[PDB]
Amino acid sequence: PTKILPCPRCNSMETKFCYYNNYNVNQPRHFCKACQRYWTSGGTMRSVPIG
Amino acid sequence: PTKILPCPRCNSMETKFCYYNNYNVNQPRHFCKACQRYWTSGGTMRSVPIG
DNA sequence: TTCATAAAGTATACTTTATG
DNA sequence: AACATAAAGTATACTTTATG
Ligand SMILES: [Zn+2]
Ligand SMILES: [Zn+2]
C-alpha cells in the first residue's frame, strides 16, 4: 500500500491510499486529489459526482 | 476521560470528550452537541461563532 | 516577534449506506 | 431477496491557524 497509483478516471498521479474497503486487503481504496473522487484499485468504478 | 461534563456555555449535558488540545493532558477539549461549540475544560473560553 | 493556549481545520480509520 | 463490493459517511485523532 506504499506505491502511488494513477487515477483511473482522470490519469493524475496526485493520489493517495486511504483505507482497505470492506475490511479486505484486496480492496485498497485510493483518492485522487485532482478529481476529488475515490476509487478501489482493481475493482470496478461507477460514475460518481466530481467533488 | 469518559465522565460527561456540562457545557459551560449553554449548560447542556449532551457533550463529548474529543481530544487533548496542544498535546497537553491538562487541556481536555470537549464538544457540546447542543450549542455546537468546543471548549477546553479548565481553560479560558472566548466568544466563538455558535455552529 | 515569540509563545502558550483557544480555536479551527484536516487526515485517519472505522462504520453505514448504496448499488447491481 | 440477498450479498459482495462501491460508495458514502463519521467518530477519532492529529495538525494548523488564531488569539492575547
Ligand atoms: Zn483523479
Ligand atoms: Zn453548549
Q: For residue A44, give the amino acid letter.
A: T
Distance B38 CA to C4 C1' (A): 19
What H or E segment, with its residue span, contains residue A32? strand A28-32
Resolution rounded to one decimal, in angstroms:
2.3
Domain that holds residue A19: 1-51
Q: How far apart are CA A11 and CA B10, in angstroms?
A: 50
SS3 assignment, position A44? coil
**CA B35, B38, B40, B43 torsion: positive or negative?**
negative
Nucleotides in C strand less than 7 A from protein CB: 4-8, 12-16, 19-20
Residue in this structure with the C-alpha cell 457540546, named with its chain if needed: B32
Total domains, chain B = 1
C-alpha distances (whole Å) from B41 to each of A20, A27, A37 are 36, 41, 38
Going by the annotation, the residues of the binding site of A for Zn(2+) are 7, 10, 32, 35
Yes or no: say if B11 and B26 are a contact pair by the CB < 8 Å rule. Answer: no
Ranges of beta strands (E only) in B1-51 are: 15-20, 28-32, 37-40
Distance CA B36, CA B34 (A): 5
> How many angstroms does the Cα of residue A26 sit away from the middle of ligand 1?
20
Closest CA to A16 of A42, A46, A38: A38
Q: Is A23 helix (H, G, I), strand (E, B) or coil?
A: helix
